[PDB]
């Protein structure tokens, strides 16, 4: 599985969903997650993220390990997203800010 980590929060560019062959992104108010059962690990999404927030599960930084289980839990509750949409309004003010998990919305 590929994992969305911290920098997606409050950026949510959605560029990643275009390239996904299996449509395994689920949508929340200010973050996207990849559903781990569904991902086929084709890695096509991780060059597409402008926030460079996607990682192979096995490459998630040490300090972002929480995101692996978080993607798995929220994918079960959040709706499937299959079409790109516009980035959140202030997405590049927040792009690159560390510690955005305190801002996540369910
Ligand atoms: S690695 Fe592939 S299947 Fe997995 S979310 Fe990314 S683009 Fe979709
Ligand atoms: S910011 Fe998020 S919505 Fe996709 S393109 Fe990057 S993982």
CATH of the domain at 62: 3.30.70.20
Q: 26, 78 in Cβ contact below 8 A? A: yes
Stated in angstroms to one decimal place, the resolution of this structure is 2.3
> Domain containing 82: what range?
1-106
* Cα–Cα separations (whole angstroms), residue 48 to 4, 17, 34: 12, 9, 14
The string of DSSP codes covering 36-76 is TTT------STTT-TT--EEEGGG--GGGTHHHHHHHHHHT
Annotated binding site for [4Fe-4S] cluster: 20, 39, 42, 45
What kind and span of H or E run contains 2? strand 2-4
**DSSP for residue 79:** P
State which approach was used to obtain the coordinates.
X-ray
Q: Rounded to the nearest whole angstrom, what is the distance from the C-alpha of residue 56 to the centroid of ligand 2?
A: 14
Q: Measured between alpha carbons, how far is 63 from 91 in angstroms, rounded to an integer?
A: 23
Domains in the chain: how many in total?
1
Q: Rounded to the nearest whole angstrom, what is the distance from the C-alpha of residue 101 to the centroid of ligand 2?
A: 14
Ligand nearest the Cα atom of residue 37? 1
Ligand nearest the Cα atom of residue 32? 2
Q: Which of 26, 28, 48 is nearest to 37 (CA)?
A: 26
């Amino acid at each position: 599985a590929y994992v969305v980590t911290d920098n997606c929060i409050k950026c949510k560019y959605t560029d990643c969903v275009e390239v996904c062959p299996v449509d395994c992104f689920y949508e929340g108010p200010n973050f996207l997650v990849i559903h781990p059962d569904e991902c086929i690990d084709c890695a096509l999404c991780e060059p597409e993220c402008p926030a460079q927030a996607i990682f192979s599960e096995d490459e998630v930084p040490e300090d972002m390990q929480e995101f692996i289980q978080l993607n798995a839990e929220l994918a079960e509750v959040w709706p499937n997203i299959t079409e790109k949409k516009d980035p959140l309004p202030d997405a590049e003010d927040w792009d690159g800010v560390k510690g955005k998990l305190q801002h996540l919305e369910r």
